Amino acid sequence: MSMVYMNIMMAFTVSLVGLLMYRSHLMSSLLCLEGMMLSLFVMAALTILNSHFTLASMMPIILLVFAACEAALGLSLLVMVSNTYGTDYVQNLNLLQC
Amino acid sequence: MMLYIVFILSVIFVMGFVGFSSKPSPIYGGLGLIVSGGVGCGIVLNFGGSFLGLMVFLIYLGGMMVVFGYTTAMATEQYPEIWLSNKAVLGAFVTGLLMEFFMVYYVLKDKEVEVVFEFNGLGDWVIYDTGDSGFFSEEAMGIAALYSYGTWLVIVTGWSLLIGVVVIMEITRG
Amino acid sequence: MNLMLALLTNFTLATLLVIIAFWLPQLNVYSEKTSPYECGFDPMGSARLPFSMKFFLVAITFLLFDLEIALLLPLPWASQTANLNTMLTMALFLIILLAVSLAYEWTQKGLEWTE
Amino acid sequence: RATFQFLPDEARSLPPPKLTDPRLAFVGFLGYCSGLIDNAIRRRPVLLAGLHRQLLYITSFVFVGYYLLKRQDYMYAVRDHDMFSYIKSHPEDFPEKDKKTYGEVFEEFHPVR
Amino acid sequence: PGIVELPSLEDLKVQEVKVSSSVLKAAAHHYGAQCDKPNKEFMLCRWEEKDPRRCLEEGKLVNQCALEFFRQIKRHCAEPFTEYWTCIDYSGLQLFRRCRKQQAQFDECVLDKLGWVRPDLGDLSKVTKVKTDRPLPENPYHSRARPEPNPEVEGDLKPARHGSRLFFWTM
Amino acid sequence: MNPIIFIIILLTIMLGTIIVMISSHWLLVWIGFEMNMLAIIPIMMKNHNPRATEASTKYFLTQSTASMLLMMAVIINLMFSGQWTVMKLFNPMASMLMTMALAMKLGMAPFHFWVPEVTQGIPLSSGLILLTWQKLAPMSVLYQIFPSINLNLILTLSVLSILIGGWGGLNQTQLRKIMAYSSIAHMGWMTAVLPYNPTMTLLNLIIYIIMTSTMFTMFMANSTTTTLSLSHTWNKTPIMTVLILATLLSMGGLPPLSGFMPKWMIIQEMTKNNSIILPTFMAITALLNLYFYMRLTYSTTLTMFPSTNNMKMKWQFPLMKKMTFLPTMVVLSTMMLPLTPMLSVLE
Amino acid sequence: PFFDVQKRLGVDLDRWMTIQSAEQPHKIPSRCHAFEKEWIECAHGIGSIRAEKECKIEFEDFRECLLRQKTMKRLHAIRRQREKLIKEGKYTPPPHH
Amino acid sequence: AKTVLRQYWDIPEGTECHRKTYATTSIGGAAGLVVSAYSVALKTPTSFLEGVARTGRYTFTAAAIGAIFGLTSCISAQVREKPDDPLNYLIGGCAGGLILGARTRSYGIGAAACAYMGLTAALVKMGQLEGWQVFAEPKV
Ligand SMILES: CCCCCCCCCCCCCCCCCC(=O)OC[C@H](COP(=O)(O)OCCN)OC(=O)CCCCCCCCCCCCCCCCC
Ligand SMILES: CCCCCCCCCCCCCCCCCC(=O)OC[C@H](COP(=O)(O)OCCN)OC(=O)CCCCCCCCCCCCCCCCC
Ligand SMILES: CCCCCCCCCCCCCCCCCC(=O)OC[C@H](COP(=O)(O)OCCN)OC(=O)CCCCCCCCCCCCCCCCC
Ligand SMILES: CCCCCCCCCCCCCCCCCC(=O)OC[C@H](COP(=O)(O)OCCN)OC(=O)CCCCCCCCCCCCCCCCC
Ligand SMILES: CCCCCCCCCCCCO[C@@H]1O[C@H](CO)[C@@H](O[C@H]2O[C@H](CO)[C@@H](O)[C@H](O)[C@H]2O)[C@H](O)[C@H]1O
Ligand SMILES: CCCCCCCCCCCCO[C@@H]1O[C@H](CO)[C@@H](O[C@H]2O[C@H](CO)[C@@H](O)[C@H](O)[C@H]2O)[C@H](O)[C@H]1O
Ligand SMILES: CCCCCCCCCCCCO[C@@H]1O[C@H](CO)[C@@H](O[C@H]2O[C@H](CO)[C@@H](O)[C@H](O)[C@H]2O)[C@H](O)[C@H]1O
Ligand SMILES: CCCCCCCCCCCCO[C@@H]1O[C@H](CO)[C@@H](O[C@H]2O[C@H](CO)[C@@H](O)[C@H](O)[C@H]2O)[C@H](O)[C@H]1O
Ligand SMILES: CCCCCCCCCCCCO[C@@H]1O[C@H](CO)[C@@H](O[C@H]2O[C@H](CO)[C@@H](O)[C@H](O)[C@H]2O)[C@H](O)[C@H]1O
Ligand SMILES: CCCCCCCCCCCCO[C@@H]1O[C@H](CO)[C@@H](O[C@H]2O[C@H](CO)[C@@H](O)[C@H](O)[C@H]2O)[C@H](O)[C@H]1O
Ligand SMILES: N=C(N)NC(=N)NCCc1ccc(I)c(Cl)c1
């Protein structure tokens, strides 16, 4: 494939690894989720734009809309996690082992 | 050198991703996502999608403004971590750049590269269309069709956004 | 090119002004001068401590509302369609659902800040 | 054959299940058992209570079961219609054998000593 | 997979119409009326044939008519036309509405001297019919033969033989 | 939650699932999953306690991750075929990513860790939706993409799910965690037969849903969530202990009960394709599920556990719970084996 | 679709955007319109199992149009052979190039 | 795994034992690493050094079981001049079980391993001989 795809696919993989390798802050992982969607938007936009798939030009826009619904949903849960424990640390969410 | 504009921007795209993927303080992660969103807009714009590029930049600037506010409220510590402050963050950061730098070095040297899958390094312009002379933007025609062809898409997206408001109100009412 | 040249010139002009600002004046740095400002007395606690956000729910709603305008900004182009019956119905439909969501959040006291 | 149709039109050329179908009698019986369980979980006299309710359990089960049995029969008719037509379309894959008798075919004998 | 057949550089030679877009735009409406026939025969050819190599001859007649059309203007209405497209060329958008006065002078000149009538609003966007002696292409996509359909299953739906035949079930 | 808001949110959970099942376009399939995920989270958080918050967070992170892998597969598929039709995929890398994406959505092993924890952290009514309705959409996609799925990958997930589900349930005293590991074990049977006969995947899916709905409804009827709390049922409602016994023996796959039907038809399809070792291994490993079903029947119906004095107060009040469809569901869960040939309705 | 309500009701929900050779606004064609049309018409009605082998030629051409991997391989080879002769002093490009 | 598995099955039973032992060791070592990775990921080691210690302990145990099975099964075949006899893998399988028992300091594990590994290995050779399919390709 064209060389641009090497870096966009690489960017998606970097964010996927960033998502799967947690640290403490839950906000940091939510950012990696937003980054994953950004690479998908760009990767989809390139294909659609380059192939002149006219009606598919709206598809990346629709992608962003449900990205915001996910980010808003993620932030809502972060608020509740923060209220319970006073931090957004993911090590506090370990009550359900038992 | 200018013929490789999309490649150069895409290199910065990855560098911004390594930025926030190594997960320093979310303040700096948001900075890395803004840079990537900025150059990502530049990449898409160079393929003829001025509206798509500017829109994704505009959305992500608004999103990272909220993330900034939430960070100072709910994701801050006494000593927020930069990329150099933490050994795990620095190791991921350096590893990302070295993996990136070696992909660039070899794809440029050979005009091709095998990184799992084969990528051609002739420059991204070679795949472009050769014959355009319409009196409109094809991206604008495709996007505007959402309101004539995408009735079903309009309904499900509009409904999901309304439900989204209802849901976040429910989720955060302790 | 013109665009990249214009951006480079603006941000280079700003950078030069900062370089002059730091290297031209005579400096005298000591601990008390560079201490954090708080009206004459030393701060109590780090400025990095959490700062509660009382408008957190409006902030999340902004994300959803800020995506609606991405869906609406194509409307000037959509008005050039021949199928104006469908386009006008879906345009009004989208804006009304935005208004309904606003009215819901308003009536449910989502726009009032937490006290 | 018709896309997303419970009972295509061609299914009407098959005979409908009889109303005395043994399978349908069993389905009606399951409805009767459901009615009894309904009384028991709610601590009502199992056999006597709510005969109107018990009647509707039997009737609803038989009603739904009749259509399921009709589609069941239809799908097996379709399977055979497909299978036989395919055999006709490909004779060389289903050739008729020459049937030897047991006086000609040699089978080995294994004594049970 | 084959050699792409390209016309020789000799076959691609024709006397070009070397005028600027402002000149073309200033003469567009009359050119649309005067050179309709070869133009619409070239555009039928391109859309039917779907191959630039298959319409070169029609392309040249488009060029030849253009040169003949512009030579008539040069002979009879050079100065009024030069004023008109000079006005068009000034505009960054090459707008018609800034040069109605010079357009009127050009229009009346060609009308008087050549009987040229300007097409009305909507005329040049009409779909027209064109008579051609070129044969309609047979396989413009160079399609291979389509694979044969699966043999159709037809007959009378009979009850399944001995029912479901699932294990012990008799129905 | 306002009752009207609860109904609107529930209907949106169903609408997202329906969209997935009726869509011919990969983008609308992805939208259906996203709409479904958005609506279910408030049902998880309905009681607002730290365990519900933890459960919803773990659920959101898992489902959101799966959707990104799902959309990655769709875009890779678009590059290599230029279309969006919901059908076989045209790139093996896309097939793997989509297959993993659906495995995480279903909670198949080794992507299973969230299922026991999320189920434990949410009420019983929400757990019922999670372990039943939420399986429909991912399975409906596997039903359409299976011709391009890697056989080794899908059978590996099925094998691991049956083992981990069976082993995981042996150590559980919490009913919601017992149902969760049971669901993982049953997911494996559905996908194991998918490469050979998708019709048998639907049959197992339908019968699993009926039996799982029956159990959850009976747990809700008595507000029981632990083994010991359920062991008091013989002293409140004796009839409910017999229904639990019959249903649990059915989930164990014992003839002549209905739950034997899917295990039986799956073994038939696998043997027709010369797969002998795998169904044998699967049937024996399902004995682990029978073991910890049998423990529940012992503590619930076949013995009488100690009671408390305050239990006498409950004798004087009737069951008020709706228990919708429980009489029908329990009969279907148990007495359906004679009608096995009716599986052709799903063909 | 798992349930084909769109066909039963004859309503078009999403199949208008499934393929790039479907009707576009202002009849703007995709770049691979002809290739995908040829592939779709070759494979129509015969099923994927047959279409995988009997329409291989059409699909391969369509794939080449989409990703252009064979063209880029060809151009990469010519460009390589040119630099081989430039350094070796064995070829001078023409003025027009 | 397909490449290493193919190599083992491409050199005839009882011939070139050293090559066989490399294949079974390669399979064993990979299995041990897979076990270490999940173990380290899901049960965090207290120190980086210990996590390395756990990794080496599992990878060596796994590789030993592979090498001894490959050595025993080939040497038994060559000695007995019975290349295609399932019994050879039974000897190799049990020997592996003993190595596992030794590495665990548990006779009971060693006893059970020698049995179940013995049967399982012998079952694999019969499957190769008779073409038993574990992940059988769909056909009907
Ligand atoms: C279920 C009864 C047995 C109880 C013990 C459980 C045994 C193991 C259960 C596993 C399934 C094994 C069932 C074996 C029989 C199924 C095969 C079969 O019976 O053939 C198909 C059957 C039609 O039977 P057929 O041979 O045609 O005889 C007609 C007589 N009029 O058509 C059918 O398949 C339906 C027959 C199912 C058998 C039960 C229904 C028989 C009808 C009596 C229903 C009760 C009616 C009375 C209602 C009383 C209400 C209080
Ligand atoms: C032609 C008919 C042949 C019968 C086939 C039976 C097959 C099993 C059907 C299962 C459904 C049974 C009905 C649901 C149970 C409800 C009955 C109950 O809960 O208790 C018994 C009850 C009498 O006690 P009471 O609660 O005080 O009510 C007063 C009404 N006289 O009510 C009664 O008076 C008795 C009601 C029936 C009792 C059933 C006892 C349990 C049977 C299950 C054992 C398994 C069945 C055999 C397996 C082979 C199947 C053929
Ligand atoms: C696969 C082969 C086997 C075939 C399996 C077939 C299964 C599907 C068949 C349907 C199964 C459910 C049948 C339930 C029958 C009992 C209904 C009943 O007696 O209700 C009594 C009464 C409510 O009845 P009512 O709503 O007034 O009647 C009008 C309905 N439109 O008030 C009551 O007390 C009812 C309370 C007990 C019922 C449980 C709660 C459910 C509520 C149901 C409401 C009524 C539904 C009507 C069913 C009609 C189905 C055709
Ligand atoms: C049909 C062909 C297909 C074949 C498949 C098999 C069909 C059978 C499916 C069964 C469906 C479940 C319904 C079973 C009905 C059982 C009725 C019953 O148990 O009697 C009710 C009684 C409840 O007590 P109560 O309501 O309060 O009455 C006064 C006594 N206190 O109960 C009690 O008080 C008992 C309390 C003590 C518990 C004793 C438990 C041992 C007896 C269990 C028998 C039922 C086993 C069912 C399992 C399947 C059997 C094959
Ligand atoms: C969770 C993982 C996160 C990382 C995700 C990364 C996604 C990257 C997607 C890249 C997709 C590349 O897909 C891969 O392309 C090459 C093209 O040479 C194909 O290559 C193969 O098929 C084509 C023709 O069919 C030919 O080149 C040849 O037969 C063979 O090399 C592979 O069959 C395909 O699988
Ligand atoms: C904050 C850090 C940001 C890091 C950004 C990293 C950007 C990535 C570097 C990309 C560099 C691209 O480098 C580009 O390679 C091609 C190789 O053909 C060169 O192009 C070359 O083509 C012809 C070949 O016939 C040569 O004669 C010519 O002299 C040369 O220009 C460009 O001159 C060069 O600019
Ligand atoms: C919460 C859900 C809220 C949903 C609210 C939906 C409100 C929709 C109101 C109707 C909007 C469109 O209203 C409708 O527009 C079309 C064209 O635009 C009009 O149509 C009129 O103009 C068009 C062309 O422009 C002609 O084809 C038509 O003959 C003529 O009648 C209709 O006369 C008018 O009834
Ligand atoms: C189609 C778009 C144009 C249509 C308008 C769409 C937006 C509608 C906004 C909400 C309308 C009803 O919802 C809203 O309910 C709250 C009740 O708490 C009322 O708000 C009430 O308290 C707030 C704060 O003190 C004040 O606005 C006001 O003093 C009082 O009315 C609003 O008066 C009413 O407007
Ligand atoms: C032909 C190919 C043959 C391939 C053979 C593959 C054999 C399978 C090996 C699986 C990995 C080894 O399995 C692992 O071994 C180590 C041995 O220390 C065991 O470890 C156990 O015994 C010792 C001593 O107690 C310690 O390592 C450890 O504290 C304990 O848990 C693990 O409990 C077991 O899970
Ligand atoms: C705890 C018990 C767990 C379950 C144990 C079940 C044991 C079942 C035995 C595994 C199946 C048989 O094992 C497998 O058989 C196939 C034949 O189809 C062999 O297939 C082999 O045949 C040829 C030789 O003809 C080889 O060159 C080739 O490498 C390979 O394809 C495999 O090399 C073998 O690994
Ligand atoms: N095995 C598959 N994947 N499909 C499948 N069920 N093939 C079997 C064919 C079949 C069987 C019964 C009927 I009734 C019908 Cl109509 C067709």
From Swiss-Prot, chain A:
| Positions of modified residues (N-formylmethionine) | M1
Q: How does it sit in the membrane?
A: Multi-pass membrane protein
Query: Which cellular compartments is it found in?
Result: Mitochondrion inner membrane
Q: Give, as one word, the top-level EC class.
A: translocase
The record lists the catalysed reaction(s) as:
a ubiquinone + NADH + 5 H(+)(in) = a ubiquinol + NAD(+) + 4 H(+)(out)
The entry's cellular-component GO terms read: mitochondrial inner membrane; respiratory chain complex I
The impact of changing V65A is: In strain: 66
InterPro entries of this UniProt entry?
NADH_UbQ_OxRdtase_chain4L/K, NUOK/Mnh_C1-like
Q: GO:BP terms for this protein?
A: ATP synthesis coupled electron transport
Give the record's subunit note.
Answer: Core subunit of respiratory chain NADH dehydrogenase (Complex I) which is composed of 45 different subunits.
Q: What is the name attached to this protein's record?
A: NADH-ubiquinone oxidoreductase chain 4L
Protein's organism = Bos taurus (Bovine)
UniProtKB/Swiss-Prot annotation, chain D:
What family is this?
A: Belongs to the complex I NDUFC2 subunit family.
Q: Which PANTHER family match?
A: NADH DEHYDROGENASE [UBIQUINONE] 1 SUBUNIT C2-RELATED, NADH-UBIQUINONE OXIDOREDUCTASE SUBUNIT B14.5B
Protein keywords:
Acetylation, Electron transport, Membrane, Mitochondrion, Mitochondrion inner membrane, Respiratory chain, Transmembrane, Transmembrane helix, Transport
Write down the species.
Bos taurus (Bovine)
Is Membrane set as a keyword in this record?
A: yes
Major localization class: mitochondrion
Q: Enumerate the InterPro entries for this protein.
A: NDUC2
Domain of life, source organism = Eukaryota
Q: Where are its TM segments located? A: 50-69
Quaternary structure (record)? Complex I is composed of 45 different subunits. Interacts with TMEM242.
Q: What does this protein do?
A: Accessory subunit of the mitochondrial membrane respiratory chain NADH dehydrogenase (Complex I), that is believed not to be involved in catalysis but required for the complex assembly. Complex I functions in the transfer of electrons from NADH to the respiratory chain. The immediate electron acceptor for the enzyme is believed to be ubiquinone.
Q: Name one GO biological process term.
A: mitochondrial respiratory chain complex I assembly
State where the protein is found: Mitochondrion inner membrane
PTM annotation, UniProt: There is a minor unacetylated form of subunit B14.5b.
Bilayer topology reads: Single-pass membrane protein
Annotated Gene Ontology cellular components are: mitochondrial inner membrane; mitochondrion; respiratory chain complex I
**What name goes with this protein?**
NADH dehydrogenase [ubiquinone] 1 subunit C2
Curated annotation (Swiss-Prot), chain F:
- What compartments host this protein? Mitochondrion inner membrane
The organism sits in which domain of life? Eukaryota
Annotated protein name in UniProt: NADH-ubiquinone oxidoreductase chain 2
The record ties this protein, via InterPro entries, to: Complex_I_Subunit_2 (IPR050175), NADH_DH_su2_C (IPR010933), NADH_UbQ_OxRdtase_chain2 (IPR003917), ND/Mrp_TM (IPR001750)
What does the record give as EC number?
7.1.1.2
Q: Which reaction is the catalytic activity of this chain?
A: a ubiquinone + NADH + 5 H(+)(in) = a ubiquinol + NAD(+) + 4 H(+)(out)
PANTHER family documented for this protein? NADH-UBIQUINONE OXIDOREDUCTASE CHAIN 2
Record-level GO BP terms:
mitochondrial electron transport, NADH to ubiquinone; mitochondrial respiratory chain complex I assembly
Q: Which gene encodes it?
A: MT-ND2
Which coarse location class applies to the principal site listed for this UniProt protein?
mitochondrion
Q: Name one GO molecular function term.
A: NADH dehydrogenase (ubiquinone) activity
Q: What class of enzyme is it?
A: translocase
Q: Write the record's keywords in alphabetical order, separated by commas.
A: Electron transport, Formylation, Membrane, Mitochondrion, Mitochondrion inner membrane, NAD, Respiratory chain, Translocase, Transmembrane, Transmembrane helix, Transport, Ubiquinone
Membrane topology, from the record: Multi-pass membrane protein
Describe the family membership recorded for this protein in Swiss-Prot or TrEMBL: Belongs to the complex I subunit 2 family.
In the record, which positions carry N-formylmethionine? M1
Role description? Core subunit of the mitochondrial membrane respiratory chain NADH dehydrogenase (Complex I) which catalyzes electron transfer from NADH through the respiratory chain, using ubiquinone as an electron acceptor. Essential for the catalytic activity and assembly of complex I.
Q: Tell me which species this is from.
A: Bos taurus
User: Is Aminoacyl-tRNA synthetase one of the keywords UniProt gives this record?
Assistant: no
Swiss-Prot record, chain H:
Q: Name one GO biological process term.
A: mitochondrial electron transport, NADH to ubiquinone
Instruction: List residues traversing the bilayer.
Output: 21-42, 57-79
How is the subunit organization of this protein annotated in UniProt?
A: Complex I is composed of 45 different subunits.
Under the heading PANTHER family, the entry gives: NADH DEHYDROGENASE [UBIQUINONE] 1 ALPHA SUBCOMPLEX SUBUNIT 11, NADH-UBIQUINONE OXIDOREDUCTASE SUBUNIT
Q: List localization entries.
A: Mitochondrion inner membrane
Organism for this UniProt entry: Bos taurus
Q: How does it sit in the membrane?
A: Multi-pass membrane protein
The family note in this entry says: Belongs to the complex I NDUFA11 subunit family.
What GO cellular component term, any one, is given? mitochondrion
Q: Which residues carry this modification: N-acetylalanine?
A: A1
- Which keywords does the record carry? Acetylation, Electron transport, Membrane, Mitochondrion, Mitochondrion inner membrane, Respiratory chain, Transmembrane, Transmembrane helix, Transport
Name of this protein: NADH dehydrogenase [ubiquinone] 1 alpha subcomplex subunit 11
Magnesium listed as a keyword: no
Chain's role:
Accessory subunit of the mitochondrial membrane respiratory chain NADH dehydrogenase (Complex I), that is believed not to be involved in catalysis. Complex I functions in the transfer of electrons from NADH to the respiratory chain. The immediate electron acceptor for the enzyme is believed to be ubiquinone.
